[PDB]
């Protein structure tokens, strides 16, 4: 459960598009994006 989630993070961090997002989007920005979905 804890294991599935950290292994999917490792995966997403393995690919340049999702890595970039996950590194450059702050938690505060998620709310700014949500409001314009």
């Amino acid at each position: 459960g804890s294991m599935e989630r950290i292994k999917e993070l490792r995966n997403l961090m393995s690919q340049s598009r999702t890595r970039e997002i996950l590194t450059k989007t702050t938690v505060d920005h998620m709310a700014i994006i949500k409001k314009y979905t």
């Binding site: 804890s2 294991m3 989630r5 950290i6 490792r10 938690v27």
Partner: protein, 73 residues
């Protein structure tokens, strides 16, 4: 293919579900917030006996691997 982002969101919730009260730091990147929650959770679960040493070790090593991928390029 705004699904790159829907997939990160989905995963993010698994670290911070709507119904947590331990909310992530706002100025933090999604990645450090998640890892950081993954650590605090691996310690808690390992105390409570929810997870065993091998399970604890692996999660910790995946986390240091993730941190390296942030702290470069």
């Amino acid at each position: 293919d705004e699904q790159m982002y829907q997939r990160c969101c989905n995963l993010f919730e698994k670290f911070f579900p709507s119904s947590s009260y331990r909310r992530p730091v706002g100025i933090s990147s999604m990645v450090e917030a998640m890892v950081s929650r993954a650590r605090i959770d691996a310690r808690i679960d390992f105390e409570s006996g929810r997870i065993k040493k091998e399970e604890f070790t692996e999660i910790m090593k995946i986390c240091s691997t993730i941190e390296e991928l942030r702290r470069q390029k």
